[PDB]
Design an enzyme around this catalytic site. Structure first.
Site, PDB file in Angstrom:
ATOM      1  N   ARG A 153     -17.386 102.786  13.558  1.00 58.28           N
ATOM      2  CA  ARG A 153     -18.631 102.177  14.016  1.00 58.28           C
ATOM      3  C   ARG A 153     -18.591 102.054  15.539  1.00 58.28           C
ATOM      4  O   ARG A 153     -17.704 101.407  16.091  1.00 58.28           O
ATOM      5  CB  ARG A 153     -18.847 100.802  13.375  1.00 58.28           C
ATOM      6  N   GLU A 169     -18.859  99.702   3.201  1.00 59.94           N
ATOM      7  CA  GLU A 169     -20.098 100.349   3.622  1.00 59.94           C
ATOM      8  C   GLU A 169     -19.881 101.663   4.369  1.00 59.94           C
ATOM      9  O   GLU A 169     -20.641 102.613   4.208  1.00 59.94           O
ATOM     10  CB  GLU A 169     -20.883  99.378   4.501  1.00 59.94           C
ATOM     11  N   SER A 227     -26.986 100.426  12.532  1.00 65.30           N
ATOM     12  CA  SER A 227     -25.565 100.682  12.735  1.00 65.30           C
ATOM     13  C   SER A 227     -25.356 102.104  13.230  1.00 65.30           C
ATOM     14  O   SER A 227     -25.978 103.033  12.720  1.00 65.30           O
ATOM     15  CB  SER A 227     -24.785 100.476  11.430  1.00 65.30           C
TER      16      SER A 227
END
Ligand SMILES: Nc1ncnc2c1ncn2[C@@H]1O[C@H](COP(=O)(O)OP(N)(=O)O)[C@@H](O)[C@H]1O
Ligand SMILES: Nc1ncnc2c1ncn2[C@@H]1O[C@H](COP(=O)(O)OP(N)(=O)O)[C@@H](O)[C@H]1O
Ligand SMILES: [Mg+2]
Ligand SMILES: [Mg+2]
Lengths: 355, 355
Positions: free
Chosen positions: A193, A124, A181
């Protein structure tokens, strides 16, 4: 083999499809019938079955990709209907599918029920970053892919203006989908992240459906546009009688979201529209505040918001723009992107040569 | 003149009352009758009218304050009923009142309808900090005022343990009332409001009342204790089919709060109790996450939570303890205080000599 990239999220499936427009005389000459059928079906319809939609205005034309020139199309449908998509995929057929998002893992075995299909799962993070950086690099048909709201604090002068990302580092990316996110991008090869929040688009949609009985994202936004959130929220001036000067909290700022709903008489007089707007405002401002804290922490002053919570949602965009600008005294810039729901699907597609 | 400190918040009024217990023979000798009446009424009742409550277990006994020894009492009632409090204050009477919180400003003129009363407004920040540092310094009758949950990640071994704040700097104070205020305390003379969030106790209570029809904070907590929040929340494993290893998000973590409520069939099967628990969990985890970001930003590893959102609310305390410990790999400590709703009222009282 048609070239797809697919982002299977908690709520929506996003698909990017590259349509060749340099199909010569021999190439067409018995392209397999199902291949012609797919292309015709995809390009001759804007709605697919009952829940599929091609976002025609986002189409990138005359793009050169993998040595072919063609058009890049953007299509979305609810994840709930992926079994239908797969079932119809077992109807007529060879294809390699690059897929990202959580559903690339959850529905792995289901995609493999299609005999003539290899499924390559992509991360992702790599997809979002590669997709965002790619689209901004090719531009939106000559126009800026990225924009901001100039003078976001004054409604009389506030307007959408293109923003240049030719040197896009560093960058904070705030992905507002079902959840939220947040990524810090320091280079094309260096990103992480930072954190997330579970109070995202699905929170808005779920709460709004419980409180107002709305049955679509668009209806929820329409209700919110007619509402007054101050009927549900307790404001600084409800507590102080006016402004809190010592800490520069204006009287109109929200002190407690839904805080007036602790009183039975106010619950009885509030409208659905008021509750839809208070839900939108509450979720959006909380994301803005979390975004600001991460940016300060990461020492990054450009914050880009993506994901589909913001599609056809000008209210939330302006709330985000105003909040970052206000609280940071102009140090932070809220940035937005025309293709904001589709970057994962594009990044997936771009991973195709590595297979 | 009875010695009071008062914190008038958006939701609750908190009162600290110092009762002299070294009243000699001459001092009593015609203390004005109304003064005796007040003391008798306050010490001989635990409930005051219909909505007033003395928190007897919090009482500090044999405290030396302003050169007198006495007991410090803690009393609360809804701000909604302050007009009643004031009206009864105009019944029988000389008193100086130190008051803090937003209502010290909002209801200024109302307190001045009491002829024999001077109202000194004190800043919320100075009061909270002075009150917290004072109470911890005198202890809770010899016991720790401050505690934490040891091994907050393992329910079999998790238990409330005293915590020492003899050198309380630096400190992050997270005040969860109607809204949420966050303070960084670097010294007794050096502290600043870092940020806040409007998603606080009134959000929990307001949303919970809309969703479940509960009519008290305690009923809301009781409903939440019987619920399963996973019926309303969409979890990581609902999206991935399992855990997200690449970013260490476990399958049981919440991906989207209320995210399952976007589906009509799930809205139709969810219970009130499930919705109460999901509301509590959602608001509490969002506060925990904001608290963690501020602490990292301020470079402070001790986070103290106060305010009345946490009274008789063990669930939220354990959620906060677990979250800070988990996400920080043990670097951050969630701390709690026995008198957490009353520090402003105590700090107000302590400002008495400066008038
Ligand atoms: N047609 C739509 N249907 C459902 N949700 C929609 C929608 N259009 C916009 N949204 C919003 O977008 C959010 C999903 O955004 P997206 O970025 O695709 O999330 P995800 N997790 O599916 O990958 C939803 O929560 C909703 O708030
Ligand atoms: N008896 C109670 N009545 C109303 N709210 C109560 C309550 N006991 C606990 N609470 C919770 O405490 C919160 C108010 O906390 P407090 O710290 O006194 O806030 P404030 N703004 O009035 O100063 C409420 O939002 C609620 O979540
Ligand atoms: Mg997504
Ligand atoms: Mg307060």
């Amino acid at each position: 083999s048609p070239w797809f990239g697919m982002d299977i999220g908690g709520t929506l499936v996003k698909l990017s499809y590259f349509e060749p427009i340099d199909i010569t005389a021999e190439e067409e000459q018995e392209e397999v019938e199902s291949l012609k059928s797919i292309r015709k079906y995809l390009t001759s319809n804007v709605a697919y079955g009952s829940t599929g939609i091609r976002d025609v205005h986002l189409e990138l034309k005359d793009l050169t990709l993998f040595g072919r020139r063609g058009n890049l199309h953007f299509i979305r449908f609810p994840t709930q209907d992926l079994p239908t998509f797969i079932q119809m995929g077992r109807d007529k057929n060879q294809t390699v599918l690059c897929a990202t998002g959580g559903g690339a893992y959850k529905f792995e075995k289901d995609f493999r029920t299609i005999g003539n299909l290899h499924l390559h799962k992509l991360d992702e993070l790599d997809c979002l970053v590669k997709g965002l950086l790619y689209i901004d690099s090719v531009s939106f048909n000559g126009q800026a892919e990225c924009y901001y709201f100039a003078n976001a604090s004054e409604p009389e002068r506030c307007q959408k203006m293109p923003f240049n990302l030719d040197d896009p580092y560093p960058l904070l990316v705030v992905n507002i989908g079902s959840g939220v996110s947040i990524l810090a991008v320091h280079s094309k090869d260096n990103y992480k992240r930072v954190t997330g929040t579970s109070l995202g688009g699905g929170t808005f949609l779920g709460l709004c459906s419980l409180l107002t009985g709305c049955e679509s994202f668009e209806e929820a936004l329409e209700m919110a546009s007619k509402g007054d959130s101050t009927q549900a929220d307790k404001l600084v001036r409800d507590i102080y009688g006016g402004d809190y000067e010592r800490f520069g909290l204006p009287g109109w700022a929200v002190a407690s979201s839904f805080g007036n709903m602790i009183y039975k008489e106010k619950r009885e007089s509030v409208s659905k529209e008021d509750l839809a707007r208070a839900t939108l405002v509450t979720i959006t401002n909380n994301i803005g505040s979390v975004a600001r804290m991460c940016a300060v922490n990461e020492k990054i002053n450009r914050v880009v918001f993506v994901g589909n919570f913001l599609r056809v949602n000008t209210l939330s965009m302006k709330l985000l723009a105003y909040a970052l600008d206000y609280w940071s005294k102009g140090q932070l810039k809220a940035l937005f992107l025309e293709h904001e729901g589709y970057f994962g699907a594009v990044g997936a597609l771009l991973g195709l040569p590595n297979f």
